[PDB]
Amino acid sequence: AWYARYPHILEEATRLPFAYPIGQYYDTGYSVASATEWSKYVDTSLTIPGVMCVNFTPTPGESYNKNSPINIAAQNVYTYVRHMNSGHANYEQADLMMYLLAMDSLYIFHSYVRKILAISKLYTPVNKYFPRALLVALGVDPEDVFANQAQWEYFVNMVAYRAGAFAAPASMTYYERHAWMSNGLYVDQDVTRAQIYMFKPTMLWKYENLGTTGTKLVPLMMPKAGDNRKLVDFQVLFNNLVSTMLGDEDFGIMSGDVFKAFGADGLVKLLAVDSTTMTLPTYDPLILAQIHSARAVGAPILETSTLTGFPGRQWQITQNPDVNNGAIIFHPSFGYDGQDHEELSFRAMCSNMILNLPGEAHSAEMIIEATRLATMFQVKAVPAGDTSKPVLYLPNGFGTEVVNDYTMISVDKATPHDLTIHTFFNNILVPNAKENYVANLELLNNIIQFDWAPQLYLTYGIAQESFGPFAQLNDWTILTGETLARMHEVCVTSMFDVPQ
Amino acid sequence: AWYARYPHILEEATRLPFAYPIGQYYDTGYSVASATEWSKYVDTSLTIPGVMCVNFTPTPGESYNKNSPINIAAQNVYTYVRHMNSGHANYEQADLMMYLLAMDSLYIFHSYVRKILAISKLYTPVNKYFPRALLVALGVDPEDVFANQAQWEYFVNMVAYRAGAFAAPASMTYYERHAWMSNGLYVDQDVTRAQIYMFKPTMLWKYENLGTTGTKLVPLMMPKAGDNRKLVDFQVLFNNLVSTMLGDEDFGIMSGDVFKAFGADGLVKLLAVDSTTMTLPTYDPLILAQIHSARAVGAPILETSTLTGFPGRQWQITQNPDVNNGAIIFHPSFGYDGQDHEELSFRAMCSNMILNLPGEAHSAEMIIEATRLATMFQVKAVPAGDTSKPVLYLPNGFGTEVVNDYTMISVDKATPHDLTIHTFFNNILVPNAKENYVANLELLNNIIQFDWAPQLYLTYGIAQESFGPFAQLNDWTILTGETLARMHEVCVTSMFDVPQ
Amino acid sequence: AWYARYPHILEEATRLPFAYPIGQYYDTGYSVASATEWSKYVDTSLTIPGVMCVN
Amino acid sequence: PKAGDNRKLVDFQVLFNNLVSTMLGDEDFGIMSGDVFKAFGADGLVKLLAVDSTTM
Amino acid sequence: FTPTPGESYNKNSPINIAAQNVYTYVRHMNSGHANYEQADLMMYLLAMDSLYIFHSYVRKILAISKLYTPVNKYFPRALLVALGVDPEDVFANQAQWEYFVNMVAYRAGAF
């Protein structure tokens, strides 16, 4: 060949600088020097996004009866605590189970602040997003972690010490699943300049035992991305979390009874951190499998949230013993977008989802673990009133965690190329504006930069027509709501299961 | 360990049919029962495209004086023919070189009709685009191949017999590249229900021999995908391809000189076909690398094409002994969209290209072979007149072939779900209309269904702003005009050569 | 002998979950999309009883 | 800081932030760091040693 | 002391020769980006030298203050006076000094 005869000309001809370090703006330049008269018609910008954050919410699953897996697990752990290990008989099954859920929220908070501490020591020349973009996506000021890192470390250690006052079973996979999910960095590819997936809890459950009418886990809001929160705000959040937890007699005898039934080696163990413990991003395909099938349900509903025609639709877990035979009722109203309007794009999520999977042959565990974060709407919630500004949807069942939002961190194409935060569901609405089509195209390109990005459903407001899954398909199926509800029931039963 | 002690429920809960055969419309249905009142706001339509045809054009490599690599190769092959072996003095070097260029067009046409005949025997139940969609994308009537298979077979055999009468050197790797490109299907993911890439000539060079002005090569059009031409149109094309070529007495004199110079074994031989010669799709990442880094230049300019301010910009490989010292002359003008107006989206190609490659370490052969189909504009061609409706762009030296446009085949949105043909460049213009945005969105989704799809530069007419490369970048670099011209000179010289 | 020489399509086309656990309401859904205007004329409810006590 | 000037930790933090004010956030410095990280390996770069309470 | 690259008034200075050599090794053998010259890379290397000098300086300031011995009453107040740092600000917030030194070592690894 000619290439074998003259390899020197081929070598000197094709020496190009590869491996551009992502994290800053790049300008391609002009091939035509007279193209400056067409200013916006030539796109010389080139931005590579680096961080996608999955804003998740811990849930016990769908529950409207006593036949829910949460109530079955409550009855089983109550039998193991009292009827086999001599309990105190000052509480029911549901009080113990809501106490266990409060433990889950505590361990999620500890893994969250441990990830916040461990992220800030990551520095590399090939990625300029490390570690400021991850701290921006977590809603924490990076200067407050640069300046007082030792205070952050000792606060994390003190959280791990104070969380050991109560007890929780180690063999329950719910705790270790939430702690592993909330404390990981997951690259979308096995390359040195990959993109970071993340899991930030926006919801934490706060114990609210007031009155005789039963306990309740009220919502507690976590810092959203772009809010520069310091260590004092996280300490205030932690003290608000254990305000009604420590100093409670019922919680004290519950911790004593769990410490009696399960041994000292049978309880969970929060690991101590120090100055040499840092985490690196790992490649997890099973994380990408459930990230791909993740379906957003929108921002949660609080007591302060105003809804026209929807009163009392807050995301609370109730423990009223006078109604429903004292069941742990938790079924929320989805589709709320954070404010009081119609949110036309959420109608695109009313079709049956497409379960996409890598490879050709799929095991049962792969299909079950790929549908952990999926949620399909089933029936519209009937409003109590003649006028209704939003539209809410009741699901047919969800897993141990739902997805509310997503967060994109990428460099801006305009001066001075700082980080931009883009919050979006799977559904993206593009209304009548000349500045919204190019922004939506840039958001689409930034989404498809990631490998297993969730399947979007873009609604165009000027054509009154939405679009299906905007993702590349390899081996897919159509999932009905009944089969996904069955898989969610299996997942919630297996996660809350404890061995006796 | 709930999955271990209850494996039957885990096995039964995840029995899903995953191998969905592409090639038909799929209605996912409504997950919410009352979502049928939202009309097009719930998109329950899912289509997977199957055919991407890359429409190319053979070129000598932008000759503009005697110092071009094609003229140097003409001098080298003329010294090899007439100085090393006792030849004739009736023909010059440029006549022999353009005879060799016309032999490439004849071999491309033979491989074209051979692929038309060999495609129609492809059938698999998991891909319903076989073989009707490939025959639609190749521009033939699919029913005419099935109804007249015996007349189609001997036509290809007679084309091979009447094109094998002349000689062309097999040591020259121009023919062994073009014939290998023009036949054979190329899957994009090496799976069973993969997507097929193709290569079809948009045009071919028909030999016409004039008097003292020269033996200039002329354009000859080819049927596009929405034509459904029968066998007699291809017979007419083959008849006027060699109408003034087989009727020339001096043609065989220089044809036999190649035979006696290069021997009887170092010649290009055409493979005869029978009823069992069936081609199969193969996986080649070398083809996908140059498919991914490909840039469209537009439709060729003909003598019948009307251009305001561009009277003599027709694509012709001229050779006049009177002017330019008897050199082969070929400098086409790109940027022609087929109509007599300026294509607004062609301004987006004035930025520097992005060479994206898989993996981390790239050899020099991979870099020089990944830039074969790319073509970058350098400077606008000066119009001859006070007004000009289109805008044409002169290249900085193109490679051995140029991509005109692309043809994409997919099933229809509505009844009866027949094949639809989409013709688009690398630049897609979305004008301000009611229904163009969702058509552009489904075009984008169908393009990103393909794995190594070319990078699209979408220009929006409402915002008067275009966007950069719409492709997933993995390991990329910015290519300037000078480096790509340096690569293209090497890639032109490496094909037009003889190692003796 | 089409099933013998094409067994993969036959295997993939019939992957259905068959062991439905009784004890809960099952909504079969609407096969016709515009059948929700017929209200109770389309029964999409399927219940399986579990206990018969002979007193 | 010269000897005899009682400088606190805030002054040293101000000096450090003045040192890397134009260093971090520079595109030319970023591609320079990427090119040195490409030419010299990860084991071929300098290694600032971590300190703790037992290192004196 | 003061860190210096040496005397330089020509292109034959050892600093310029080392700049050209490291530029050849970065670009002409390891595929550089060609957005900078030899001298930009060498001044960047000198900025790295000043960064590592600062890190060793604050590390010495931190490590000196834990030295106490009865036979030498200069330890460690005289060394902290000679370094221009208040010894009370190292007695009172030593952990902040240690974590600042560690954060300097972490941030200096970005380049």
Side-chain angles (χ1 to χ4, degrees):
Chain A
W2 201 91
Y3 296 154
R5 256 183 292 144
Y6 317 75
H8 28 83
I9 312 159
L10 206 68
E11 169 244 305
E12 281 122 30
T14 65
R15 28 181 57 246
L16 261 294
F18 276 103
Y20 277 82
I22 63 170
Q24 79 240 59
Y25 165 74
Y26 281 119
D27 187 69
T28 69
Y30 283 118
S31 79
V32 178
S34 35
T36 60
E37 51 211 19
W38 316 315
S39 39
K40 278 142 67 196
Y41 277 104
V42 196
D43 192 86
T44 57
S45 300
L46 193 57
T47 64
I48 311 295
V51 179
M52 168 147 305
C53 199
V54 176
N55 295 345
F56 81 105
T57 284
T59 43
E62 189 87 0
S63 191
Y64 39 81
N65 292 328
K66 283 215 59 84
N67 254 309
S68 324
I70 170 77
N71 288 271
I72 294 159
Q75 184 232 338
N76 281 342
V77 76
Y78 181 72
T79 300
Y80 185 69
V81 158
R82 280 208 62 268
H83 292 314
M84 321 185 48
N85 285 253
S86 305
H88 267 53
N90 300 123
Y91 56 93
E92 287 106 306
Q93 32 191 68
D95 296 308
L96 179 63
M97 192 55 188
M98 302 214 69
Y99 158 79
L100 291 187
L101 296 173
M103 292 338 270
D104 167 51
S105 88
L106 281 204
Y107 305 148
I108 284 169
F109 186 77
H110 171 255
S111 78
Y112 174 48
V113 295
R114 184 169 145 233
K115 202 186 61 188
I116 288 183
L117 170 83
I119 268 176
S120 57
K121 315 156 45 179
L122 277 191
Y123 273 94
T124 171
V126 301
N127 208 334
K128 318 267 297 312
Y129 286 127
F130 280 5
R132 210 183 98 88
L134 317 155
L135 295 180
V136 155
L138 286 166
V140 55
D141 189 31
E143 271 68 72
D144 210 88
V145 201
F146 184 31
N148 42 287
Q149 161 110 6
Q151 282 99 294
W152 268 95
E153 179 173 300
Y154 275 78
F155 166 68
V156 161
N157 265 353
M158 273 338 268
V159 157
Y161 286 146
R162 285 149 201 184
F166 323 98
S171 42
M172 169 173 323
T173 45
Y174 188 61
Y175 297 130
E176 87 197 13
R177 165 120 174 81
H178 272 287
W180 162 69
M181 171 185 38
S182 194
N183 196 33
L185 297 178
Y186 305 108
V187 279
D188 76 320
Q189 246 170 30
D190 214 353
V191 286
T192 50
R193 232 155 285 104
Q195 274 109 359
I196 301 295
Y197 275 113
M198 250 174 44
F199 289 91
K200 194 254 283 178
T202 168
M203 271 285 288
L204 278 187
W205 295 115
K206 194 203 156 340
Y207 189 61
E208 277 286 274
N209 196 3
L210 327 167
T212 172
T213 81
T215 73
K216 187 186 303 194
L217 287 183
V218 88
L220 179 69
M221 281 334 285
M222 270 324 109
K224 307 288 208 51
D227 291 322
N228 294 296
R229 286 300 174 255
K230 299 148 167 328
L231 189 44
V232 286
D233 302 281
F234 278 78
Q235 279 167 340
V236 157
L237 281 174
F238 184 58
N239 296 335
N240 214 332
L241 211 42
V242 292
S243 179
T244 86
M245 272 195 98
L246 271 174
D248 209 310
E249 315 102 340
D250 289 67
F251 258 40
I253 57 179
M254 237 161 284
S255 306
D257 282 25
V258 179
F259 186 66
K260 171 172 25 179
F262 299 94
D265 322 67
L267 299 185
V268 302
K269 303 298 183 301
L270 292 193
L271 290 306
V273 86
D274 45 30
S275 66
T276 195
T277 294
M278 58 188 83
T279 85
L280 40 76
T282 82
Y283 176 56
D284 211 323
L286 265 293
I287 275 294
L288 307 162
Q290 59 194 253
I291 276 178
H292 197 180
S293 324
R295 280 165 81 82
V297 314
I301 319 181
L302 325 161
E303 275 91 1
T304 89
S305 313
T306 164
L307 293 175
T308 301
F310 290 102
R313 288 305 217 275
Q314 44 257 13
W315 289 23
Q316 56 191 9
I317 324 182
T318 51
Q319 208 256 322
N320 207 345
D322 314 286
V323 299
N324 295 74
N325 322 287
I328 317 178
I329 300 165
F330 178 59
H331 67 294
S333 314
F334 286 174
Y336 179 47
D337 77 300
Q339 48 225 5
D340 206 20
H341 64 81
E342 168 58 50
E343 191 55 277
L344 277 310
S345 61
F346 254 125
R347 304 162 161 192
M349 315 281 322
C350 303
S351 86
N352 287 298
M353 86 180 229
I354 313 294
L355 177 57
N356 201 13
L357 273 170
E360 302 300 285
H362 317 307
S363 81
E365 309 98 33
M366 177 54 145
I367 304 162
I368 274 279
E369 210 99 20
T371 51
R372 293 302 196 104
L373 271 47
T375 292
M376 323 176 22
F377 305 142
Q378 195 217 342
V379 44
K380 282 204 304 180
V382 42
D386 62 287
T387 164
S388 296
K389 248 76 86 178
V391 166
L392 303 185
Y393 313 96
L394 298 162
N396 38 50
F398 44 85
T400 36
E401 45 251 29
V402 313
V403 171
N404 319 90
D405 295 277
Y406 298 96
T407 299
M408 184 97 69
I409 318 292
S410 184
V411 284
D412 205 6
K413 66 213 300 292
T415 302
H417 319 306
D418 216 13
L419 312 160
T420 48
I421 299 112
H422 274 148
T423 49
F424 54 92
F425 324 102
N426 288 74
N427 41 273
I428 295 113
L429 183 59
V430 194
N432 229 330
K434 68 164 286 165
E435 61 262 7
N436 277 349
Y437 296 113
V438 277
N440 181 56
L441 206 62
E442 195 176 10
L443 176 80
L444 276 158
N445 184 33
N446 288 329
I447 275 148
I448 70 162
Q449 279 308 303
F450 296 88
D451 215 335
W452 303 99
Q455 313 154 18
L456 320 158
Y457 294 89
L458 305 108
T459 300
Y460 270 90
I462 83 143
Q464 283 95 33
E465 173 160 13
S466 314
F467 188 60
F470 204 95
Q472 187 192 244
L473 300 186
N474 322 292
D475 206 41
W476 53 270
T477 195
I478 304 169
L479 265 189
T480 332
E482 297 94 67
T483 81
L484 194 42
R486 189 175 173 187
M487 285 196 239
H488 283 322
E489 165 111 358
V490 166
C491 154
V492 169
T493 298
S494 64
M495 281 305 82
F496 280 133
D497 173 46
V498 68
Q500 43 247 40
Chain B
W2 196 89
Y3 289 161
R5 59 157 161 166
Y6 291 94
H8 31 268
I9 173 175
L10 197 67
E11 189 97 19
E12 287 274 354
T14 55
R15 298 293 285 278
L16 302 167
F18 270 113
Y20 268 80
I22 73 164
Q24 54 215 327
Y25 167 77
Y26 280 116
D27 189 57
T28 73
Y30 293 88
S31 172
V32 174
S34 72
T36 63
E37 319 169 300
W38 289 326
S39 304
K40 308 173 301 305
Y41 273 136
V42 196
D43 190 64
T44 69
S45 300
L46 153 73
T47 63
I48 315 294
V51 181
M52 172 149 279
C53 199
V54 178
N55 294 353
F56 81 107
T57 279
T59 39
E62 207 220 28
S63 191
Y64 54 111
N65 42 45
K66 269 282 292 148
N67 287 38
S68 180
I70 177 77
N71 276 280
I72 297 161
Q75 184 220 306
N76 263 271
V77 79
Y78 192 60
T79 309
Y80 185 73
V81 160
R82 77 141 300 172
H83 173 187
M84 261 57 102
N85 312 79
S86 306
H88 295 71
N90 313 95
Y91 64 97
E92 316 157 308
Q93 46 153 359
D95 303 303
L96 179 56
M97 185 37 78
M98 290 183 354
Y99 154 74
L100 288 186
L101 292 176
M103 291 335 278
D104 178 45
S105 284
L106 253 76
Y107 294 156
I108 281 169
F109 186 78
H110 165 260
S111 295
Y112 181 37
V113 295
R114 189 193 172 275
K115 204 186 59 186
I116 287 158
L117 184 88
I119 264 183
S120 49
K121 314 197 264 140
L122 276 181
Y123 163 72
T124 164
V126 309
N127 207 320
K128 287 182 78 221
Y129 288 117
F130 283 179
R132 198 192 149 83
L134 313 157
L135 292 172
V136 155
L138 281 179
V140 315
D141 204 13
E143 272 68 72
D144 195 88
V145 192
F146 296 146
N148 309 318
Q149 156 184 354
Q151 289 104 79
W152 261 93
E153 183 160 344
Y154 101 106
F155 170 61
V156 179
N157 283 306
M158 278 314 275
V159 155
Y161 179 70
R162 298 237 180 278
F166 318 105
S171 45
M172 176 166 313
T173 78
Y174 191 58
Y175 310 117
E176 90 157 348
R177 155 162 195 88
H178 282 220
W180 148 76
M181 191 196 328
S182 52
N183 47 58
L185 299 322
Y186 298 112
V187 287
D188 75 319
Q189 226 150 0
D190 207 8
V191 290
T192 321
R193 314 132 49 239
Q195 274 113 356
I196 301 298
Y197 279 108
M198 260 198 315
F199 289 99
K200 178 197 87 92
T202 328
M203 69 167 320
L204 275 183
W205 299 113
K206 173 207 150 32
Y207 205 104
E208 48 181 32
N209 208 308
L210 327 162
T212 36
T213 171
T215 83
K216 146 183 55 82
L217 276 181
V218 86
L220 180 84
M221 261 315 112
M222 224 60 54
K224 304 189 159 322
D227 280 3
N228 290 326
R229 303 266 152 275
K230 317 268 196 309
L231 176 54
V232 314
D233 301 288
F234 282 81
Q235 274 182 343
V236 155
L237 284 186
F238 184 63
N239 277 337
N240 77 328
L241 193 62
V242 293
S243 51
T244 84
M245 181 155 138
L246 269 160
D248 254 31
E249 189 43 68
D250 67 340
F251 237 91
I253 303 303
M254 104 191 67
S255 155
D257 278 9
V258 184
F259 208 105
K260 57 107 182 178
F262 291 93
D265 283 298
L267 295 175
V268 180
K269 34 191 83 85
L270 307 179
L271 314 83
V273 294
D274 39 43
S275 277
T276 199
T277 40
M278 189 205 317
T279 180
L280 312 172
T282 53
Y283 181 60
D284 206 24
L286 253 173
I287 272 291
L288 306 180
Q290 57 191 240
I291 274 181
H292 179 37
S293 313
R295 286 163 87 83
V297 313
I301 311 182
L302 320 172
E303 279 84 18
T304 88
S305 292
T306 161
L307 291 181
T308 312
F310 303 98
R313 300 304 215 279
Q314 52 248 7
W315 291 22
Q316 37 181 32
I317 311 173
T318 64
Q319 177 249 323
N320 197 358
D322 289 24
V323 298
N324 223 304
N325 300 331
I328 297 165
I329 289 300
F330 177 55
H331 36 86
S333 286
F334 297 150
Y336 180 41
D337 79 292
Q339 307 161 27
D340 202 18
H341 80 299
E342 166 184 7
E343 173 92 355
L344 264 170
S345 66
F346 259 136
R347 312 182 172 180
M349 302 315 277
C350 302
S351 67
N352 280 311
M353 90 168 306
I354 311 296
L355 176 63
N356 178 36
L357 281 174
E360 310 258 19
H362 327 300
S363 51
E365 281 78 41
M366 171 66 48
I367 300 160
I368 197 84
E369 284 279 336
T371 53
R372 300 302 285 270
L373 283 298
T375 297
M376 302 201 23
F377 301 145
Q378 176 205 22
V379 48
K380 296 151 59 161
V382 202
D386 67 336
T387 181
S388 59
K389 291 205 187 51
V391 170
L392 301 189
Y393 309 95
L394 285 160
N396 215 335
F398 43 83
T400 172
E401 46 256 6
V402 285
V403 171
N404 308 88
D405 48 22
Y406 304 94
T407 289
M408 186 166 84
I409 311 294
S410 194
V411 295
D412 211 5
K413 200 62 150 25
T415 329
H417 318 300
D418 56 6
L419 304 163
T420 43
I421 306 146
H422 284 129
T423 282
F424 56 94
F425 308 116
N426 268 87
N427 38 275
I428 301 126
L429 173 64
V430 198
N432 204 347
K434 164 87 152 40
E435 74 277 335
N436 286 1
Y437 299 103
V438 73
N440 180 48
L441 205 64
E442 64 158 29
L443 167 84
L444 278 166
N445 193 19
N446 289 327
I447 285 160
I448 70 165
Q449 279 314 299
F450 298 96
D451 214 46
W452 292 112
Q455 317 161 21
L456 321 159
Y457 294 85
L458 311 110
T459 310
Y460 270 85
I462 164 158
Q464 293 101 21
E465 172 176 6
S466 92
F467 194 71
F470 201 92
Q472 191 195 113
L473 305 177
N474 162 259
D475 199 5
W476 56 273
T477 181
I478 304 177
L479 275 189
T480 47
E482 281 75 28
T483 42
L484 201 53
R486 216 176 322 263
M487 289 175 183
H488 277 150
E489 287 207 16
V490 173
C491 93
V492 160
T493 306
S494 49
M495 307 274 132
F496 289 126
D497 74 321
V498 40
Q500 314 154 330
Chain C
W2 196 89
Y3 289 161
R5 59 157 161 166
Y6 291 94
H8 31 268
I9 173 175
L10 197 67
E11 189 97 19
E12 287 274 354
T14 55
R15 298 293 285 278
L16 302 167
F18 270 113
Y20 268 80
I22 73 164
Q24 54 215 327
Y25 167 77
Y26 280 116
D27 189 57
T28 73
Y30 293 88
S31 172
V32 174
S34 72
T36 63
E37 319 169 300
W38 289 326
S39 304
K40 308 173 301 305
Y41 273 136
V42 196
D43 190 65
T44 69
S45 300
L46 153 73
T47 63
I48 315 294
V51 181
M52 172 149 279
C53 199
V54 178
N55 294 352
Chain D
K2 307 288 208 51
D5 291 322
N6 294 296
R7 286 300 174 255
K8 299 148 167 328
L9 189 44
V10 286
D11 302 281
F12 278 78
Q13 279 167 340
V14 157
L15 281 174
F16 184 58
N17 296 335
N18 214 332
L19 211 42
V20 292
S21 179
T22 86
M23 272 195 98
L24 271 174
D26 209 310
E27 315 102 340
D28 289 67
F29 258 40
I31 57 179
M32 237 161 284
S33 306
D35 282 24
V36 179
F37 186 66
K38 171 172 25 179
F40 299 94
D43 322 67
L45 299 185
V46 302
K47 303 298 183 301
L48 292 193
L49 290 306
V51 86
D52 45 30
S53 66
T54 195
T55 294
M56 58 188 83
Chain E
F1 81 105
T2 284
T4 43
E7 189 87 0
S8 191
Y9 38 81
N10 292 328
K11 283 215 59 84
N12 254 309
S13 324
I15 170 77
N16 288 271
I17 294 159
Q20 184 232 338
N21 281 342
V22 76
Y23 181 72
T24 300
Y25 185 69
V26 158
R27 280 208 62 268
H28 292 314
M29 321 185 48
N30 285 253
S31 305
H33 267 53
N35 300 123
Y36 56 93
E37 287 106 306
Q38 32 191 68
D40 296 308
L41 179 63
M42 192 55 188
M43 302 214 69
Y44 158 79
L45 291 187
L46 296 173
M48 292 338 270
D49 167 51
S50 88
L51 281 204
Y52 305 148
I53 284 169
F54 186 77
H55 171 255
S56 78
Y57 174 48
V58 295
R59 184 169 145 233
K60 202 186 61 188
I61 288 183
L62 170 83
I64 268 176
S65 57
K66 315 156 45 179
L67 277 191
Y68 273 94
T69 171
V71 301
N72 208 334
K73 318 267 297 312
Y74 286 127
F75 280 5
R77 210 183 98 88
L79 317 155
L80 295 180
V81 155
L83 286 166
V85 55
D86 189 31
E88 271 68 72
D89 210 88
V90 201
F91 184 31
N93 42 287
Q94 161 110 6
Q96 282 99 294
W97 268 95
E98 179 173 300
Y99 275 78
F100 166 68
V101 161
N102 265 353
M103 273 338 268
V104 157
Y106 286 146
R107 285 149 201 184
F111 323 98

